[PDB]
Design a protein around this ligand. Structure first.
Ligand code: SF4
Lengths: 74, 111, 110
């Protein structure tokens, strides 16, 4: 994927850090966002984040995903 | 220098020599670190596996500073990670403390 | 040790804060806390002790694996089995661990 890509969460991903669902289970599945970054390296140095796709939604809310949990939208 | 029926701890210098002499026997390597929860939880079960499968060589590598070079080359991200080798090469791998998966991988390697 | 005490207190407080519990086997809890403490001591940040890194310094800068890691902060998933959800088979009913237990467990590793 590429930064700027529009994606939809197509797998069940329950999170607890959403600002409007603080400390409460909230499934992001079905939501649409924009890829903000793909964690691969830090200034040329490979890193190992296992949820490398950072997606930004409304209110600057962001969550991390595996490539297989999201799907590109035209 | 592997012992059938038990787990043998290896280092960056003793690992390969054992693998290049296992012959027809599959080699399982438990790549761990001392201060890892799932790794400690798995220890007992791994010990029993070595006792149950004598046709398989069970080893363990402490992925610390000393064995840094070997861990790097073998490839490990999740601790623990079990590498299954045969014919001087890695043929199987189970990441994490997944007993059932490890069992299936061992049974796959045996057959 | 100062770092270890701070790490133990952090774990106890974070568990209560996130409604998660320590492993029924506190030995698991203890080794993870020591591992976190060791990383905090040598790297400045408590990188997860159940992950192997090719470039620790880079990881510290990226912060994904700095405890509490992204998987834990976002999905309450703790691979180290330090913060277990009340649905995990190995989850106990405690959110506290005696310093004495940490010491005994560390000692057993020698
Ligand atoms: S899995 Fe994450 S939250 Fe759990 S001990 Fe490792 S870094 Fe901390």
């Amino acid at each position: 994927m590429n930064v700027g890509d529009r994606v939809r969460v197509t797998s069940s991903v329950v999170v607890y850090h959403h600002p409007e669902h603080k400390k409460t289970a909230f499934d992001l599945q079905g939501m649409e966002g924009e890829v903000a970054a793909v964690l691969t390296e830090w200034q040329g140095r490979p890193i190992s984040a296992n949820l490398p796709v950072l997606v930004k939604f409304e209110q600057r809310f962001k969550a991390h995903f595996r490539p297989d949990e999201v799907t590109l939208i035209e | 220098e592997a012992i059938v029926g038990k787990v043998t701890e290896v280092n960056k210098d003793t690992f390969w020599p054992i693998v290049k002499a296992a012959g027809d026997k599959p080699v399982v390597l438990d790549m761990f670190t001392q201060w890892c929860g799932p790794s400690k939880a798995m220890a007992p079960k791994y010990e029993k596996l070595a006792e149950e499968y004598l046709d398989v060589i069970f080893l363990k590598l402490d992925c610390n500073q000393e064995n840094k070079t070997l861990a790097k080359e073998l490839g490990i991200r999740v601790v623990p990670t079990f590498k299954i080798l045969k014919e001087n090469s890695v043929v199987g791998e189970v990441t994490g403390a997944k007993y059932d998966k490890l069992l299936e991988a061992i049974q796959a390697a045996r057959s | 040790n100062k770092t270890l005490a701070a790490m133990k207190n952090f774990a106890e407080q974070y568990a209560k804060r996130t409604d998660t519990y320590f492993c029924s086997d506190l030995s698991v809890t203890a080794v993870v806390i020591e591992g976190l403490a060791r990383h905090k001591e040598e790297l400045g940040s408590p990188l997860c002790p159940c992950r192997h890194y090719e470039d620790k310094e880079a990881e510290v800068k990226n912060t994904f694996w700095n405890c509490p890691c992204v998987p834990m902060r976002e999905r309450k998933e703790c691979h180290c089995m330090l913060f277990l959800t009340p649905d995990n088979d190995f989850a106990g009913d405690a959110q506290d661990i005696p310093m004495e237990t940490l010491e005994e467990v560390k000692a057993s590793m020698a």
